[PDB]
Design a protein around this nucleic acid. Structure first.
Ligand SMILES: [Mg+2]
Ligand SMILES: [Mg+2]
Ligand SMILES: [Mg+2]
Ligand SMILES: [Mg+2]
Ligand SMILES: [Mg+2]
Ligand SMILES: [Mg+2]
Ligand SMILES: [Mg+2]
Ligand SMILES: [Mg+2]
Ligand SMILES: [Mg+2]
Ligand SMILES: [Mg+2]
Ligand SMILES: [Mg+2]
Ligand SMILES: [Mg+2]
Ligand SMILES: [Mg+2]
Ligand SMILES: [Mg+2]
Ligand SMILES: [Mg+2]
Ligand SMILES: [Mg+2]
Ligand SMILES: [Mg+2]
Lengths: 103, 89, 62, 58
RNA sequence: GAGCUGUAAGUAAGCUUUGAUCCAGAGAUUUCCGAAUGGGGAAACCCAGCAUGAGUUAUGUCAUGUUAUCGAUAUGUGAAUACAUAGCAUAUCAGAAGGCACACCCGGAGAACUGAAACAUCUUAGUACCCGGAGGAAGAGAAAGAAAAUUCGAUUCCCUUAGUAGCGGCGAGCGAAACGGGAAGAGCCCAAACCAACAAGCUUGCUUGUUGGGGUUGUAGGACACUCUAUGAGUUACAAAGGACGACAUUAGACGAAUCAUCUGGAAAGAUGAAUCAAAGAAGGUAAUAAUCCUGUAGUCGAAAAUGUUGUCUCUCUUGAGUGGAUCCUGAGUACGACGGAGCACGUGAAAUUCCGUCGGAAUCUGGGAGGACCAUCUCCUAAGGCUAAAUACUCUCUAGUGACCGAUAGUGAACCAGUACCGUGAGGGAAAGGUGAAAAGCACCCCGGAAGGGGAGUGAAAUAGAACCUGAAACCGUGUGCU
RNA sequence: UGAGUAGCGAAAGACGGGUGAGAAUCCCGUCCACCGAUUGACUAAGGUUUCCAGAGGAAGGCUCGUCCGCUCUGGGUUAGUCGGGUCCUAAGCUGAGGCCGACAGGCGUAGGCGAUGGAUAACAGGUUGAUAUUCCUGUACCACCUAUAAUCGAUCG
């Protein structure tokens, strides 16, 4: 269950196997967004903001369950399990290395 | 009370002409009577007024695309003051 | 204004905050748009002051 | 109307003919208006005739 | 535990690790009509009085308390009448009223259509409508019983007895019971004699009315006399009532094991191969069909708070066994009978038992009833006063589930801002209407046209998928055609 | 299908100009006809934004449409004396107590309720795309309040 400052690797998409960072997560539609993944081009018309708006190329949302958070000490993707040490709960990557990949 | 019985002013071309002969318009809360509107502009604006007049608007009908509702009833009040200057702007 | 319970005189503040609230709602119908500092995060404040005054008689009296 | 001790009330039941087809009627109890000694002032009230074990009127 | 500001995109300012928004417990707010209750009233409105207070030099206004009717408790006052009572005046009290799922229950009142091949006794049925009162269950209930052998034992409910004994224009049709097998298992408090005060009459007598205490059954118990026992049992639902000391269950939530690679494809969860967990191969989602991608499951934990079961102690409480029965009491206009009537499966008949109406009307332990009229003998049991858990009947909801149950003319009338549009003055009737794609990527631009639409271009695997949108059958209206 | 068939819900219009992509239908003008104890000017009953301005042409109007009583956006109703409440009662309707009845409830005294009637203080002109005795100009009246001084130990009743 990823956070807003992670750096992950996809499994199944139009562009699979590519890495990248996460910039938003949308936790009611549970669809996250990664740079450089699945560009969806828009035909915006001339609005009151964009002076004579036109075509562009921006990556848009994909689901959570095509995205797996990879091991920082190994760079192989991994299920993340949780345990708690002292006051809070931290993410072990279940490859015996807990990550620090929040910020 | 006496600070929030007046609710909004209204700026209309009926009223913005009626700034010349110094009459103001307002929008008081529905349950008040015309005497204690006079005792409110004494408090809020600190002038003394000659007379006040009120009326009612019945709650006219809403749109049809936006479905069948009614806009809120309201109580437009008009105050008459004979020497107090421009309170609001 | 959050968590200010040790003030014996708040009726100096409620009257002062409420006449502040009327300075802007009356100012809303012409122009002057910054609607956050308008009636949302200020009308909550005059509810903060009453629930820390209305209980104050209650623990006092019985 | 109501008694005192028995609390009487007309209760229903049929009444039949010689060819045995029915109807409805009531059996009203023998009420008599009389003034008795109750607490305070003596009141005048209905009471039934088989409730005669009491001192009448004073 | 990182985003949020409803359903709801767009904004424009903002909030947020100093812990938001959401999830659970607890508290403050709770305008107005409604039993409406200060008087009116066309429900959501109008008019006041009474004290306090703001305010103006005052009058107008405002603000929070306050005042309906029965009922109870206290004084005032108290007529026609003089003694008191109705009546009358103040102060406290919150008892009632209304609503309910009226589903289930208990009493009051109570039809007809229909069957008999018509129809009146009968039956549809003590059913539906109406009204009254309570509960989470109500009613019944501690033998004036069943029975006939040897008796056993409060009530309720399930199976058989059995469509039998029976009732019936002996027609249609109604229709039991005990014995037996089980479910779940508690029995108790008053009345009276007698005794101790209290008051009264009216005296050291008696009677009467209260207060305790004593006492509550039939193998005959109790009063009264005789003799012998006590700080051990019983309990806050029956038996008399309140409350501190201490284990679980609810109302949020944690953790939670196991995988890769290629191929076709817009995209793999599919095919082929190589692996792994398993108290986890329930179920759903993810661009197709996933035990190992996500949410989960099996198994484990958590609870500031607030309620419900409750175990323990603490408290209230409390004497129980025998004999003599030489006297005294055992529920009065009651039980019964006559007269019309309802219920008992039973239509008044050979008609017991049971309650109501009117009218006559007993005896008391050698008593009094009941064993399908009644009398005799023999067995059984003690009415006319009360209280009571469990077995059992229900779901408008709440929690977790299941289905050889439906998949939009089906399923509730109602998947869709449904008892809504809409029709009726009214009471009341009462519809139609689901599906773009994986993702909004919802067609920038060029051209004809005022626009609507349209041809290119463009997104997309697909626009012959264009927001009347998946699939698109028939009636039916059309277009050039081979034969005629 | 009937079928491009019956029907367009009384009646006098004609021309010029303008708007417009489009005009027998919309807007301005002259000429013509039509009611005139009414097709006129006012008030209640009802209806509830239909009212006015600006903009639009899918659907509505028995045709057409540039227009509208239809859609879209933004506005419009001012009262001490005007009708009514803070005054009165009629028919009725409710009705403390009280009668009366299987329950519910029926009837009724005191009192309240109830206008179509009784009582009561205002007019003339102007103004706006829309309101008027309501706002503005002048003129008075009615009820209650305070400061106002020809009398009375007279006033309210
Ligand atoms: Mg939003
Ligand atoms: Mg009221
Ligand atoms: Mg006062
Ligand atoms: Mg058992
Ligand atoms: Mg987990
Ligand atoms: Mg897992
Ligand atoms: Mg008889
Ligand atoms: Mg279908
Ligand atoms: Mg709808
Ligand atoms: Mg393409
Ligand atoms: Mg076809
Ligand atoms: Mg013809
Ligand atoms: Mg012309
Ligand atoms: Mg009207
Ligand atoms: Mg047309
Ligand atoms: Mg319009
Ligand atoms: Mg009268």
């Amino acid at each position: 269950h990823i956070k807003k400052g992670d750096n992950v690797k996809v499994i199944a998409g139009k562009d699979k196997g590519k890495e990248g960072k996460v910039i938003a997560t949308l936790p009611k539609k549970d669809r996250v967004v990664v740079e450089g993944v699945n560009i969806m081009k828009k035909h915006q018309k001339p609005t009151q903001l964009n002076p004579e708006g036109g075509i562009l190329e921006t990556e848009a949302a994909i689901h959570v369950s095509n995205v797996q958070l990879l091991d920082p000490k190994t760079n192989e993707p991994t299920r993340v399990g949780y345990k708690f040490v002292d006051g809070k709960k931290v993410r072990i990557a279940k490859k015996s290395g807990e990550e620090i990949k929040s910020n | 009370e006496a600070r929030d019985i007046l609710k909004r002013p209204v700026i209309t071309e009926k009223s913005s002409e009626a700034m010349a002969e110094d009459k103001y318009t307002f929008d008081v809360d529905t349950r008040v009577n015309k005497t204690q509107v006079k005792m409110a502009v004494e408090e809020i604006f600190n002038v003394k007024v000659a007379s006040v007049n009120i009326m009612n608007y019945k709650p006219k009908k809403k749109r049809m695309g936006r479905y069948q509702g009614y806009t809120n009833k309201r109580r437009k009040a008009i105050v008459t003051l004979k020497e107090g200057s421009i309170d609001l702007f | 204004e959050i968590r200010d319970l040790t003030t014996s005189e708040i009726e100096e503040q409620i009257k002062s905050s409420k006449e502040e609230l009327f300075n802007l709602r009356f100012q809303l119908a012409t122009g002057q748009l910054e609607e956050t500092a308008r009636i949302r995060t200020v009308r909550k404040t005059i509810a903060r002051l009453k629930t820390v005054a209305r209980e104050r008689e209650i623990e006092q009296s019985k | 109307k109501q008694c005192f001790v028995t609390g009487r009330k007309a209760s229903t039941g049929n009444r039949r003919s010689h060819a045995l087809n029915s109807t409805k009627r009531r059996w009203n109890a023998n009420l008599q208006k009389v003034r008795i000694l109750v607490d305070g002032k003596p009141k005048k009230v209905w009471v039934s005739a088989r409730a005669l074990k009491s001192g009448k009127v004073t």
